Ligand binder design. Structure first.
Ligand SMILES: CCONC(=O)N1CCC[C@H](C(=O)N[C@@H](C)c2nc(-c3ccc(C#N)cc3)cs2)C1
Lengths: 212, 195, 228, 206, 210, 211, 211, 195, 213
């Protein structure tokens, strides 16, 4: 697996491959799961465990979003905008990431999964949180990478990164990173899925190319 | 190491067992009373294996049977007693196994002189002849040769004597002291045998 | 070898109208890591015999050096072309090597294919054997494709797939193979099998090497990338 | 293994308006000692349902008692005989309820499905409770391979009660002669809608 | 075993072989592996037979209860969620690799659920001992858009390949076509001496008339 | 690394007064997967003797080649072909030579002896053997052997019919291997039937269920 | 298995079953367990069949070479010693043999028990195999030195029958040989225990026998 | 399971051992001759443990000692015999150990009546009294209590009789048959004792 | 650990770190060993195995060089020139690499070392070979990398490589590669040792540098 998150000047871009398992059991798996309209998460490790925490965090995020509502009135590419224009009631990425940390930490004895949460928020702007195997959260203000393939792109991403990257060059960097990881790693392959999260609109990209 | 033998006929049912209380590499006693458990209403439950499991299981079955017979004011049937014992021993099989090998015996107006063989796994069946222990290997075939349906008490006692002599002569644990338990003519009797 | 480290993936081999066609991808994996992707996995034993492997690379290299030394030993003791060893002889040698290694509980962690032409009537190539520098229709009974197993189990068929292909390509072959097949038909069938293997096998690659054992000897076609 | 301790096997076949169930008569001990030669492994549930239990003898007895309890409760509550398929599914559910602490028994259910058209009904399970509704014969026990071979060798569709008896009896006896830990006499039990015939075969007692 | 699924124009076609072996020995030569969950949802199973059968029965009855309560068409995602939540609770000790298929308001939907409680929406799936042969034939011959008949032929070919190339798979071929309006099930889709009287001795005999 | 595998298949053998039949399937399979659909198990030793065997294929092939080599050396040295009994004791010694790392091969040695009498010798891995009228080895053997015991000796039947001849015995062996492929997953594909009379060997073939 | 030898007034009786089984499956009910070591010494097989057959034939070879070298027949004691030393040389290799060598020599009628561990016990009433305890029970309960030949023959047959009856692993046919001064005789070459059961314990044959 | 006992003195050295030949859960013999290995020249090597190891080691030692005594034409000393036996048993300890428990006994004009205790590990030391087997647990303190330096042959035989009665009464292997050796008055004698 | 070898125009540059072992046992270790004046070798895996096969191969190379001689007359950095100007008797790189492969393969039951041989000779020009764990040789015509720290620089080296790199840019590439591997890997650290092998002269560079970004 090669899951990667990279902050740029106006949002955060997450990226993943599609190859599940010597036998390639599946080759169209959607690793980047939509927790909320402003918050996504990349998964690595055991698929069953990852799906379990993903459904639980969807449930918790729906409960939080219902809680956050205040009384009374105020004030192949895909793309859409947020129903919550001003982020009046969307849960924070911080809160979702830490409840995920607590969920994974309470069951260390058998859970084996690493997550990369990424989104946008009115308080902290764009976010990136890496939750490790034992359930330890670290905020990665520049970029986070995880999976078996991520080992082959640490120096590449570290060398190519800049502080305030444009959308085009950040897209090229993350695409080339996932392509290199797929080229070097047998366990990662298939089509590349990228999710760009900004202040107003989320957009989804699919790419069906690989290295030389 | 605990040898048990039992024999059922048309007008008798007899049991026999070695009177050896064993502990590690020594014999605690040559007059062990931990094996037989006589029960009111002409019943007997004969056990082998560990002395502790013997005492606990035998007293549990004895007091439960007596509780039944005093609550309901009647003597329990031997078949009911045997299957009650098997159900109780099977209930502890998967949680706290009693390592006890049971020979149930008795007299009933319903079904004559009954005998039931049963093992530590609670696998029970009625038999005309049964035995338990490593001595069973050496005595059971003798019980095949000399058993016929119309035996008398003396002929059965002679068969048991031949079994005891076989256990003395050939068995690794050269057992020589045995206690019997006869049931015939609406009686229960005890005999001790030195061969 | 106590077990595999740098492992080679499957090989496919079929008979056709003019001879043998054997295909292997050029990838050798270091666990779950494509450390090497230009590895020659099919070896030329002699002008009418080639070998391929799937398993540990060091064991295959050792076996290749053994068979090479056997080939020069044969060539030294040679007077006529009929003195040359057919693929049957090399297959028997590899089978005996694997059996003897199996008796000691010390195998070569490999599955081997030995293939080629089992007769001299179709050409005079081995009249003057050179080591350092239209086709003819050959009968199926004069061709040879062998299999040898890690336990020494061995056999022959009109088409052998070794390794992960045994479940994927073999099925397709058992539907699509037919006697007296042209070069184009054999090529497209092998390409389809390797495409399916590439799409549904992690350790395989899309960089293929085809070798033809034909009346004009062994021919290593230039390697190519499977389209799509 | 646990099944080698006591041994034994059960068999069932169908005919034209008749259906047979057969078993051996032995209680084993430590895989080689025979302690009883009448341990019948076939039990009657109702007039149109019979069960043949093979495996560990204690689990055989407990499963028979539990099934008798449930069947009698169903019959007194409903005031009618049980359909054979209902008892089959009840046995499957009871077996699966003990999924991780199984009863080591491999039962068969043999009966007549009523409608009145007396169709045969044969089913076989394992300890987990995986059924296999089979139309000609059902086999279970430690002598399963020999019984399967004999049954496909000698089965003929649509026999009467007599030829069904000789076929199933020959199958059982030949299968039991090739098993060490199963034999010592054999019960055969042929059901018809009007009567029932149970016989003890003259077998090899060794 | 070869269980197989694929998705056609407004439909899902499942197929399976009819073999059940207790080790080397074939027990049932015409077993049934395609299970009814709902009128618009079907499945096929691989793994431990008892867990498959009883999980499928539990899922079918839960789906029927939910259908009676909500009074709407059952959903494929509901069956997937219930199955995955049940399978993870036992932590892979419920050995059930199940290919689910159905049609609902969200169109056709085929899922492959694995015994540890992970699912995947797919265009086609194969599972069982003979899964690789069926997968090979499917990847060879499957296309982006096809009809009911083309998919039926493809599923039959894949199951036949699994039958011929695998020793744990054999017998006839069954398929089920699940459409929004109704389902349609074919069990045999493909399908590729007398002893004398008194010969057997007896010890005793007795007859009692019921 | 465990150095033993089972390649499956079955080998049935039957005798009469002056003939022997030896059927064997030609399937070869590792574990729920078919290597090939034609791998013969029966080999010719002399003009009046054959050996069939089931187990690991490499052990079987090496053992058969070694036994053929030893019999040919015997013929070259002692100037006469060995009877089935001589080859039987020789096979016993060869199998016992590896007593502490045994051949995984169960053999049936079939032939017709000096007296024009059909003889079989069934074997185990470590060389224990005996004469028999019928025998079977391989994956299917526990299926076929009760059938042969019922048909041939007829212990449990009160009225018997011991009227056997070559054609009925061939049909019986064909039915036996048919049931074997029916209920054994490792038995299938073509089967080869060798018939030895006083004149010599004759080989027939029969297709079975490809599954 | 059940082998049972014993001295009496007019020589020795040896008695064996003929069953042979691979675990639960019965392999053959016609195995020859009493091996003729030489003209006077007999041996009997228990445990592993291959080891017993091979090493008893090897002992026969050694005895023949010794008797040809020295020109006088060997004793039971010397054969027992040679077999015991040969079997003890393979300690720690996993052999499984239980043998009862009985015979006549210039010292008289002799009987020894040997096994793979290296025993050389000397007695007048021996029994080996799975059903050895049952045969011991029958033999010791009725053994007498002054029995006639027929009385001791029926005693041996009854002991073997009871051993086969109780023991799952003993059965098939009973073979009873008698050793005298001038050689030995096969008094019972083979006899099914089916007839023994329905003769000894269940002659009425009106109901299934209950133990 | 194999009991050996030995008792020294100034006018005697006595040995005793159970006569049980055992295999599995049965006694092959009640008159086992596989334990005593008396050597020419007033010497004895009483062994216990496995029958096969007993036979092999005892015959090896006996034939080697006889080879010495015929090559050199003299009687071997008992100290030399004991230490030769110990060295030979030690040589196989790491390679292929004989599981034999040794009591050497004999008479010399040099060193008088000698007795040596030794075990399967080849740990040897001379003693006035020794025993081997689990019976050694029960027949050691009896030897300690009743032994004095100036015993006669009858007093030693009485002590051995008390040891045999103890083995019958308390040891679970109710051993009743024993064979003795008595080296006294420049003569070796044998006896058999029941119960 | 990190051992790298990169071919460039008329030369080959090998490079290594110095760290040995959680507790750093040694921090100045010469992993690049001089088999011959025209042939060097980078070590990885257990140090004892690496040292013993490398000194055995030095012995074998001395024997080969002695036997390669013909009879009669014919015709902080450090720099050395070859005594053999025309390569009349220096052994070939492939011969040494293949006998090393045979040595490691024959005793692969316990040997657990991986080597990168780098050199120059008149037949094949500059040469790189990689001997793997089980004893399999592969000729890497572009570059070879091994060690626990090499996994972090596969994509970096693959992206930055060109066919005919100048000496300066090849030196910068290999130096930055080893620096990145040391930055990412705990098992590698210390000073960088580089060995540049050409047709005529060998250079040996020592570099002390860290990573800042
Ligand atoms: C991988 C091999 O496949 N599995 C196989 O072949 N099996 C296992 C199942 C039972 C079969 C069996 O028992 N077959 C009978 C005909 C045989 N009997 C003997 C035999 C040998 C010596 C004596 C003596 N003395 C007695 C019998 C050898 S084979 C043999």
């Amino acid at each position: 697996t090669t899951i990667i998150g990279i902050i740029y000047d106006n949002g955060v871009m997450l990226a993943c491959d599609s190859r599940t398992s010597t036998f390639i059991s599946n080759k169209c798996s959607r690793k980047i799961n939509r927790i909320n309209e402003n918050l996504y998460v990349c998964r690595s490790g055991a698929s069953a465990h990852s799906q379990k925490i993903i459904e639980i965090i969807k449930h918790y995020c729906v409960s939080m979003k219902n809680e956050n509502r205040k009384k009374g009135r105020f004030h192949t590419k895909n793309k859409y905008f947020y129903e919550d224009k001003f982020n009046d009631y969307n849960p924070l990425v911080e809160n979702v990431a830490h409840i995920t940390k607590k969920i994974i930490y309470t069951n260390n004895n058998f859970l084996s999964c690493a997550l990369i949460f990424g989104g946008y928020d009115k308080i902290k702007k764009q976010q990136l949180y890496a939750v490790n195997l034992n359930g330890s959260i670290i905020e990665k203000h520049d970029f986070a990478v995880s999976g078996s393939g991520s080992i082959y792109i640490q120096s590449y991403l570290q060398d190519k990164y800049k502080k305030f990257m444009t959308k085009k060059e950040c897209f090229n960097l993350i695409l080339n990173c996932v392509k290199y990881a797929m080229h070097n790693d047998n366990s990662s392959g298939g089509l590349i899925r990228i999710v760009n999260i900004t202040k107003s609109f989320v957009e989804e990209f699919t790419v069906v190319n690989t290295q030389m | 190491m605990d040898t048990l033998i039992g024999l059922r006929g048309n007008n008798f049912v007899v049991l026999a067992a070695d009177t050896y209380s064993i502990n590690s590499i020594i014999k605690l006693k040559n007059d062990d009373n931990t094996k037989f458990y006589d029960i009111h209403g002409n019943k007997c439950l004969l056990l082998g294996g560990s002395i502790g499991d013997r005492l606990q299981f035998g007293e549990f079955i004895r007091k439960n049977v007596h509780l039944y017979q005093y609550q309901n004011n009647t003597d329990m049937f031997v078949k009911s007693f045997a299957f009650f014992t098997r159900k109780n021993l099977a209930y502890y099989l998967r949680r706290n196994p009693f390592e006890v090998n049971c020979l149930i015996a008795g007299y009933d107006k319903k079904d004559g002189y009954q005998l039931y063989w049963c093992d530590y796994l609670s696998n029970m069946d009625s038999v005309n002849k049964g035995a338990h222990g490593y001595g069973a290997y050496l005595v059971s075939a003798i019980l095949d040769k000399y058993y016929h349906e119309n035996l008398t008490v003396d002929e059965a006692l002679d068969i048991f004597k031949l079994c005891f002599e076989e256990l003395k002569k050939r068995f690794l644990l050269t057992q020589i002291n045995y206690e019997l338990r006869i049931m015939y003519d609406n009686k229960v009797e005890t005999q001790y045998v030195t061969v | 070898t106590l077990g595999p480290v740098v492992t080679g993936t499957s090989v496919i081999a079929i008979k056709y109208k003019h001879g043998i066609m054997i295909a292997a991808d050029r990838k050798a994996s270091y666990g779950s890591y494509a450390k090497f992707q230009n590895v020659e996995r099919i070896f030329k034993i002699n002008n009418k015999t080639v070998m391929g492997f799937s398993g540990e690379l060091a064991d295959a290299q050792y076996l290749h050096e053994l068979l090479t030394r056997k080939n020069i030993n044969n060539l030294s003791e040679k007077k006529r072309k009929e003195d040359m060893y057919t693929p049957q002889h090399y297959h028997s040698y590899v089978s005996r090597v694997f059996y003897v290694r199996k008796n000691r509980i010390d195998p070569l962690f490999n599955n081997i294919i030995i293939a080629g032409i089992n007769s001299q009537k179709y050409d005079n190539n081995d009249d003057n054997v050179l080591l350092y520098t239209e086709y003819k229709e050959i009968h199926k009974d004069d061709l040879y494709i062998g299999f040898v197993d890690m336990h020494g189990t061995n056999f022959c068929d009109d088409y052998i797939t070794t390794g992960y292909a045994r479940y994927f390509a073999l099925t397709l072959l058992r539907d699509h193979y037919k006697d007296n097949m042209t070069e184009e038909e054999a090529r497209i069938l092998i390409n389809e099998c390797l495409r399916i293997l590439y799409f549904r096998d992690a350790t395989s690659s899309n960089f293929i090497q085809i070798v033809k054992v034909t009346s004009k000897g062994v021919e290593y076609e230039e390697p190519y990338i499977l389209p799509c | 293994s646990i099944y080698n301790y006591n041994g034994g096997c059960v068999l069932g076949m169908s005919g034209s308006n008749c259906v047979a169930i057969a078993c051996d008569l032995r209680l084993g001990a430590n895989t080689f000692t025979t302690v009883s030669t009448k341990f019948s492994k076939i039990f009657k549930m109702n007039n149109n349902v019979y069960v043949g239990l093979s495996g560990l003898a204690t689990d055989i007895q407990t499963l028979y008692e539990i099934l008798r309890y449930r069947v009698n409760l169903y019959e007194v509550r409903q005031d009618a005989e049980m359909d054979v398929e209902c008892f089959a599914n009840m046995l499957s559910s009871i077996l699966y309820s003990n999924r991780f602490s199984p009863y080591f028994v491999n039962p068969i259910v043999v009966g007549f499905k009523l409608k009145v058209n007396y169709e045969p009904y044969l089913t076989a399970y394992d300890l987990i409770g995986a059924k296999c509704e089979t139309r000609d014969f059902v086999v279970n026990g430690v002598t399963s391979e020999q019984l399967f071979g004999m049954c496909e060798s000698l089965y003929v569709k649509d026999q009467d009660e007599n030829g069904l008896f000789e076929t199933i009896s020959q199958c059982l006896l030949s299968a039991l002669d090739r098993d060490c830990i199963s034999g010592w006499g054999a019960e055969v039990l042929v059901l018809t809608p009007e009567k029932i015939i149970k016989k003890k075969l003259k077998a090899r007692m060794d | 075993t070869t269980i197989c699924g694929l998705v056609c124009q407004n439909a899902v076609i499942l197929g399976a072989d009819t073999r059940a072996t207790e080790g080397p020995i074939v027990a049932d030569k015409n077993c049934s592996k395609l299970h009814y969950i709902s009128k618009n949802i079907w499945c096929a199973g691989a793994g431990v037979a008892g867990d498959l059968e009883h999980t499928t029965l539990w899922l079918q009855h839960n789906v029927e209860l939910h259908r009676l309560n909500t009074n709407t068409q059952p959903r494929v995602s509901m069956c997937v969620s219930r199955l995955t939540q049940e399978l993870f609770k036992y932590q892979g000790y419920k050995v059930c690799a199940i290919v689910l298929g159905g049609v609902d308001v969200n169109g056709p939907q085929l899922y492959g659920i694995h015994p540890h409680g992970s699912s995947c929406l797919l265009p086609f799936t194969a599972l069982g001992s003979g899964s690789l042969n069926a997968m090979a034939v499917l990847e060879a011959k499957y296309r982006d858009n096809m009809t009911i008949e083309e998919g039926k032929n493809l599923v039959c070919e894949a199951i036949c390949a699994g039958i011929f190339n695998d020793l744990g798979s054999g017998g006839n071929v069954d398929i089920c076509v699940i459409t929004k309006d109704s389902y349609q099930h074919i069990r045999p889709y493909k399908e590729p001496t007398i002893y004398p009287k008194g010969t057997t001795p007896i010890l005793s005999e007795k007859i009692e008339y019921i | 690394w465990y150095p033993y595998i089972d390649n499956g298949g079955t080998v049935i053998g039957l005798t009469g007064k002056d003939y022997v039949i030896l059927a064997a399937d030609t399937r070869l399979s590792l574990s729920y997967s078919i290597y090939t659909r034609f791998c013969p198990k029966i080999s010719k030793l002399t003009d009046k003797c054959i050996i069939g065997s089931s187990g690991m294929q490499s052990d079987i092939k090496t053992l058969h080649s070694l036994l053929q080599k030893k019999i040919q050396l015997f013929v070259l040295e002692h100037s006469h072909y060995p009877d089935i009994h001589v080859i039987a004791r020789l096979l016993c010694v060869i199998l016992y030579s590896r007593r502490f790392f045994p051949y995984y091969a169960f053999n049936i040695l079939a032939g017709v002896d000096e007296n024009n009498k059909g003889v079989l010798y069934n074997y185990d891995s470590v060389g224990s053997y005996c004469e028999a009228t019928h025998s079977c080895v391989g994956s299917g053997s526990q299926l076929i052997l009760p059938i042969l015991d019922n048909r041939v000796e007829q212990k449990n039947q009160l009225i018997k019919n011991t009227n056997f001849n070559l054609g009925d015995d061939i049909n019986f062996v064909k039915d036996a291997i048919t049931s074997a492929t029916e209920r054994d997953i490792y038995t299938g594909d073509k089967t080869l039937i060798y018939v030895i009379d006083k004149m010599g060997i004759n080989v027939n073939t029969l297709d079975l269920k490809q599954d | 298995t059940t082998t049972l030898a014993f001295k009496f007034k007019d020589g020795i009786i040896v008695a064996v079953d003929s069953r042979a089984s691979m675990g639960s499956f019965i392999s053959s009910q016609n195995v020859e367990k009493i091996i003729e070591i030489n003209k006077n010494i007999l041996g009997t097989m228990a445990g592993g069949a291959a080891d017993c057959l091979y090493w008893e034939k090897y002992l026969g070879k050694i005895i023949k070479i010794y008797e040809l070298r020295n020109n006088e027949k060997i004793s039971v004691r010397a054969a027992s010693t040679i077999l015991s030393n040969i079997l003890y040389q393979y300690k720690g290799y996993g052999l499984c043999c239980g043998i009862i060598l009985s015979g006549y020599d210039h010292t008289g009628f002799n009987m020894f028990y040997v096994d793979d561990s290296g025993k050389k016990v000397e007695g007048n009433l021996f029994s080996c195999g799975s059903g050895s305890t049952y045969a011991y029970s029958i033999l010791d309960s009725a053994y007498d030195y002054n029995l006639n030949l027929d009385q001791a023959v029926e005693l041996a047959r009854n002991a073997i029958y009871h051993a086969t009856f109780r023991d799952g692993g003993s059965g098939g046919k009973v073979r009873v040989f008698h050793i005298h001064k001038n050689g030995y005789d096969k008094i019972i070459e083979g006899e099914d225990v089916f007839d023994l059961h329905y003769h000894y314990t269940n002659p009425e044959q009106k109901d299934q026998y209950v133990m």
